[PDB]
Amino acid sequence: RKFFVGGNWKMNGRKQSLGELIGTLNAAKVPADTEVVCAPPTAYIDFARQKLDPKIAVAAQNCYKVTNGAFTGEISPGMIKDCGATWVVLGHSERRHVFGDSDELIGQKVAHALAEGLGVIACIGEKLDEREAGITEKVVFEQTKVIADNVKDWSKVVLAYEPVWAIGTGKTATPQQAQEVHEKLRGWLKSNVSDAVAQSTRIIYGGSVTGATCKELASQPDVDGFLVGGASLKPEFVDIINAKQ
């Protein structure tokens, strides 16, 4: 499984700062064994694709479920592809919990994005209350099932596990518990999709990752990369891209 490192810039940056960031990434050497993807704010997808070395892919941070229509404020996989982007992050914890993306809608977006020839970074993760209630498996397996029900070709999909229960809650996710979850997800795929899919599908970690912890996290058997948040806006991102090196 090729090491995958995605940077989710979230709602940050402007042309100046993002341009500098991109300059820093273009100048860095990305191990041929690493697949790098950057997710700029929607207004900068086009901008980023133009400035980013073609070696690095561009992803949209969200998209809707149809080709076109009366959905003011939304963008379709078609527009994303039209901008040169090749991936779209779907089901991100922020879309689910802050903007209410339903599990059903996420499934529809996944189906549509893949049908449009876009790659999908499908995010899953349980909240603190769900974690506390000991229903981690229930939640992530239900979320993964919806994704699986909407994926016909896993070659274009990367599963990202977000330990939401560790975001601003005081809890700290250890690499052991990350491995623990990733192993369970791969086991679910093995049994519910196929051995081939479970073996080849990248399951990346969307939890807290820094240049000082990426090595250990990347060394975990079932952690195939990262969906980086805050660090993706800093030089440290390059260190994370080299976590396997």
Place this chain on the structure above:
Amino acid sequence: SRKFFVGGNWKMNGRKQSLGELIGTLNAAKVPADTEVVCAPPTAYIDFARQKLDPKIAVAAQNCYKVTNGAFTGEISPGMIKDCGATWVVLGHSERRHVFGDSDELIGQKVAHALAEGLGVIACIGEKLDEREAGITEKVVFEQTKVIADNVKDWSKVVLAYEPVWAIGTGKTATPQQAQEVHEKLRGWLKSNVSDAVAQSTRIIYGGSVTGATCKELASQPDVDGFLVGGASLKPEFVDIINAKQ
């Protein structure tokens, strides 16, 4: 003395190809003297549209969030909008409210933030069919307008857009007379709840179904100061609507 305002909301439609053609048409079009033309392309094309579109045409974002930066994957801020050359943002559009759940409180915060960031705001309001049926049109649009008003310190950069949601895909069809009725009531609300000055200078544009065949009569209505065009913004017909007052 209110400058005729025509905004084209492309909604989630178009690609660089189709948009570029529409833009070519607009760049070559003569915009009427006392008129203001704005185009709201899909978010991924705000940048592209601003670059191809001549400065005589303003660009608007179809939505934005309530803070400058943050952990809000999938959202953009007024700061990013201005950074791309856009000078307006459509907020409270019926689709954001009814399809995506934007609450009146959220819309008020977005309005406040967009204006604080120096962006112009096209604030949308409109009642649904059921609300229309029960005869609470005024109550509904007044509540929505008040939320907007409560978050507007200076109306110079604000344009109100009435969207007869009740007619939009419901088997109904708003007449220019019922359009005028609402606009007049809205302006009356501004006069009584804000100031006569704001009431007289604030453009209240019609966001219902508008075509080159109906823009003329709609534009002639005393309190209809322009349009927030939907489907027609995607065709040559758009230019005719821009000339609705001609």
